């Protein structure tokens, strides 16, 4: 077995233990400052996150996410409070106890040295010095020898008694030495170790309590992050306008379509007679020529649309789901081409309707003389 | 099926869609600011956490925890960078595209209205107005009727031709109206919806990307927190001083124990003769009396220790593992009582050794005359 009581039981080991006690205070002092800065950090993060602070699914998802982020803000604040009132305070009391313990150990150590020095050394020197005086005194009285015998017997009396006190003092010092080295100092060293190991345990609990309070991955944080993730995942893009259309939608507005105004003149029929036959033939020709041009314009704009759709499918296929913002420009180019095509189909359709009218009218005259104009 | 093209196909729906486009810009603008503040927050938390910045197990565990906390600091910084260069930038491009799209839609809408107004209304009014003039002209020429027939046939010629142009213009306007209301405007509205739903998808991806980057509970954060937790849990309190004792420990220092200095006078034996017998009896009495007092002092200090140990076990049993800092004072009181007891056992032992010497010496004289002192 190793311990302070068997390994540091010396003046040298006492020096080592004094420096140990200081080194452990320094370290806990750094720990307290480090924890103090975590408190500041979490508090100010709470503040920074706090500062970040309708039917629609995105709308509702967005509100849920901001609200949960505000929840995260308050949590970080509680981390700061909890760290401050729990382990930082416990750490401070542990420092204060060590500062007092430091003093108590060193004075108990001194006390035990002074006691040993007094009993084992100083008392002993005093006895020895007296013994020598009384012996020299008895020697002198033996030599200076009725009255003379009287002073000599007296010399012997005190010398003998002092001898006995000396013998007893030596035995007392012997047991002091023994208790000191085997029991007293080892006992003191052992209790210092016990205390320090208990304090190691306390510090372990302070560090684990710190980690639990300050953890960004604990249950309350996870639960916040899952709600945010569920809110985002609920977004259904193809459903975003359903509620908006329910609120604001209505039947199309279609103003009346023009008709042939019969108050000017069959209603809306071409006039095919002797004065107009050639003009109708001319118009059918010029309408048909124009229709050919318009039909070519539809053909070319459909090809353009087709080129853009192919280009967009290849681009889509090759772009990551989170980089689709990059396709928006081309999407818009495709829209404008589709609008283009639609305008051209409208023009083609208008010229076609005009041809049909012209064509059916000349067909229904056929091999007939165009009607004369009689003037009533 | 509901959609922009069936539900908002009117001037009113166009107003609704214009306000929609603005409301969506406002919302994305708030989202961009909110994300911008997350970036600032994470960056400054990185800074705050950064600022927090030997054999022994606590030592090594502590270093691991500070080092991992520094790792957490760098991660938060990467969250800030990644948020800034990914989704915040994508969000900005989405805003810019909407600002251009807003303009394109509204001018395409205007264009289609101007075309309809031109063909379906203005051209038609021009034809109608001319028709009426030419009819009144023909009426007047019919009435003012050789030359007279000439001007009348001419009147009819132009009236008939204008009639035909009018009829054709009406058919053209009819098809315009039809294409406009069924195809052109619905087509435009549909592509706006397609675009918006695609943008809803893009925004969903921006929000999910935000959540992934900024998550405090993601794998890289968890791994940091597990290392910290494993480091703290490794601490073995009963092992904290093993390496320290290996480095600094040494054999106890035991200076020589006093012995009876034979140069003054059996070596270290009490002198029991006629001049000392009574004094030895007196000393045994006074030593024995003192021993009784010292034995009582050991008894009382053992009782005190016992009271404190019981008090500390009850206190320990009733205090939570993380509140043990609160027992340190009482622990220290117990230490001082145990030291107290040890000092008293030393004193008892010293007086006992002295009694034994005195007692054995008088026992071995027993019923004998104490030796005379003869004076050579």
Swiss-Prot record, chains A, B:
Tyrosine-protein kinase that acts downstream of cell surface receptors and plays a role in the regulation of the actin cytoskeleton, microtubule assembly, cell attachment and cell spreading. Plays a role in FCER1 (high affinity immunoglobulin epsilon receptor)-mediated signaling in mast cells. Acts down-stream of the activated FCER1 receptor and the mast/stem cell growth factor receptor KIT. Plays a role in the regulation of mast cell degranulation. Plays a role in the regulation of cell differentiation and promotes neurite outgrowth in response to NGF signaling. GO terms for biological process: cardiac muscle cell proliferation; cell adhesion; cellular response to vitamin D; centrosome cycle; chemotaxis; microtubule bundle formation; myoblast proliferation; peptidyl-tyrosine phosphorylation. The modification Phosphoserine is found at residue 56. Cellular homolog of retroviral oncogenes. In contrast to the viral oncoproteins, the kinase activity of cellular FSP/FES is tightly regulated, and the kinase is inactive in normal cells in the absence of activating stimuli. The gene is FES. The keyword Cytoplasm applies. Its main location: cytoplasm. GO terms for molecular function: ATP binding; immunoglobulin receptor binding; microtubule binding; non-membrane spanning protein tyrosine kinase activity; phosphatidylinositol binding; protein tyrosine kinase activity. The keyword Coiled coil applies. This is Tyrosine-protein kinase Fes/Fps. It is found in: Cytoplasm, Cytosol; Cytoplasm, Cytoskeleton; Cell membrane; Cytoplasmic vesicle. Residues 2-274 are annotated as: Important for interaction with membranes containing phosphoinositides. Widely expressed. Detected in adult colon epithelium (at protein level). Expressed in melanocytes (at protein level). Belongs to the protein kinase superfamily. Tyr protein kinase family. Fes/fps subfamily. Keywords: ATP-binding, Cell junction, Cell membrane, Coiled coil, Cytoplasm, Cytoplasmic vesicle, Cytoskeleton, Golgi apparatus, Kinase, Lipid-binding, Membrane, Nucleotide-binding, Phosphoprotein, Proto-oncogene, SH2 domain, Transferase, Tumor suppressor, Tyrosine-protein kinase. The modification Phosphotyrosine is found at residue 241. Residues 114-149, 298-342 form a coiled coil. The coiled coil domains are important for regulating the kinase activity. They mediate homooligomerization and probably also interaction with other proteins.
């Amino acid at each position: 077995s190793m311990g302070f009581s068997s390994e540091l039981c010396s003046p040298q080991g006492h020096g080592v233990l004094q420096q140990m006690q200081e080194a452990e205070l320094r370290l806990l002092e750094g720990m307290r400052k480090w924890m103090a800065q975590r408190v500041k950090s979490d508090r100010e993060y709470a503040g920074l996150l706090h500062h970040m602070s309708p039917d629609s699914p995105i709308s509702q998802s967005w509100a849920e996410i901001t609200s949960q982020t505000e929840g995260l803000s308050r949590l970080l604040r509680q981390h700061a409070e909890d760290l401050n009132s729990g382990p930082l305070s416990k750490l401070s009391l542990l420092i204060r106890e060590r500062q007092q313990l430091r003093k108590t150990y060193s004075e108990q150590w001194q006390q035990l040295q002074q006691e040993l020095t007094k009993t084992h050394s100083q008392d002993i020197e005093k006895l020895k010095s007296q013994y020598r005086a009384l012996a020299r005194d008895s020697a002198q009285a033996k030599r200076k020898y009725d009255k003379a015998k009287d002073k000599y017997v007296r010399s012997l009396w005190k010398l003998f008694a002092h001898h006995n006190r000396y013998v007893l003092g030596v035995r007392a010092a012997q047991l002091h030495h023994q208790h000191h080295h085997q029991l007293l100092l080892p006992g003191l060293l052992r209790s210092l170790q016990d205390l320090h190991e208990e304090m190691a345990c306390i510090l372990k609990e302070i560090l684990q309590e710190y980690l639990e309070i300050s953890s960004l991955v604990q249950d309350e944080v996870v639960a916040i992050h899952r709600e945010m993730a569920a809110a985002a995942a609920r977004i259904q893009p193809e459903a975003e306008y359903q509620g908006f259309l329910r609120q604001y939608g209505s039947a199309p507005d279609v103003p009346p379509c023009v008709t042939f105004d019969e108050s000017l003149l069959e209603p809306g029929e071409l006039q095919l007679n002797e004065l107009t036959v050639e003009s109708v033939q001319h118009t059918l020709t010029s309408v048909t020529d124009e229709l050919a041009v318009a039909t070519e314009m539809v053909f070319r704009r459909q090809e353009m649309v087709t080129q853009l759709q192919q280009e967009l499918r290849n681009e889509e296929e090759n772009t990551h789901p989170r980089e689709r913002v990059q396709l928006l420009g081309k999407r818009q180019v495709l829209q404008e081409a589709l609008q283009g095509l639609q305008v051209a189909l409208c023009s083609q359709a208008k010229l076609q309707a005009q041809q049909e009218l012209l064509q059916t009218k000349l067909e229904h005259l056929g091999p007939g003389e165009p009607p004369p104009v009689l003037l009533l």
